[PDB]
Symmetry: C3
């Protein structure tokens, strides 16, 4: 899985260990091994949410499976919680786009995760 956070919060406000915490929490949430979790945080961004430049975040979570109605609600509570606690961003100023990726559409290690057919 891949989690990306873009925010206008300053770099200095991103706590040390934040990427590690995201990695561990996402492994737990998705049930995927931590070795396959990638995290990316992009601070100091020029953005607005509802016309306002108060702290906000635009995020995406890509996963092969483990994406869906109830699961995404669970992910949203988890991730908004982390953004609010760690970056002090209000949950109502966060968007998270979820993407259920097909294995054949994810490249890794010179190939893709579609190793079964030709």
């Amino acid at each position: 899985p891949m989690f990306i956070v873009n925010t206008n919060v300053p770099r200095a406000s991103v706590p040390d260990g934040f990427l590690s915490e995201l990695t561990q929490q996402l492994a737990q949430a998705t049930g995927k091994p931590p070795q396959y979790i990638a995290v990316h945080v992009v601070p100091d961004q020029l953005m607005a949410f509802g016309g306002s430049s108060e702290p906000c975040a635009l995020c995406s979570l890509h996963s092969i499976g483990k994406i869906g109605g109830a699961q995404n609600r669970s992910y949203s509570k988890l991730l908004c919680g982390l953004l609010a606690e760690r970056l002090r961003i209000s949950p109502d100023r966060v968007y998270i786009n979820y993407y259920d990726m097909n294995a054949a559409n994810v490249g890794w290690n010179n190939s893709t995760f579609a190793l079964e057919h030709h």
Copy 2:
């Protein structure tokens, strides 16, 4: 709705008011209140379009619905016009990816829109 612009145009060339203009014009075009609109502009990027480093932009617009043939052509006219006028980027050096998001696949305020 959510609009992202990545461009190699320098930050100093982004005019005061640009995010607000994007917010207001996208609210108008999508039929959604300005409260719903998020915008994100990323200048000074290392990019090329057609192998050239002249001004260009790679963009995305995500919306729950309001995405389709005629609507997307209308968004493109609107957004290319703004990029050309405000950032001096030629329309034929802009790509915009449109995404029609399922409400269940958009998180906000501790839940999703489903």
Copy 3:
């Protein structure tokens, strides 16, 4: 087509000619003329892969068509090879998300690529 690379490798480590090599090799790989190809490289990123901050890359390739099982495996070999050779990133610390875009969902030059209806 549009190819984006986000990486924690520093800007200074991106070699002269990298954007042009990506442009040309992607034109070759997808069978599309180079005029169509857009590339975007974002260094110095705060990212981790598998809980490690060793060099890694998160990438996307968007194309109208030319996306599929065997083709994507070919793109991955090409692109991981370039990231390994040029940026010294291990292929097993690279993810590439592939997107088969509908012509109606790609804007360009004041319109889209859906010009038929």
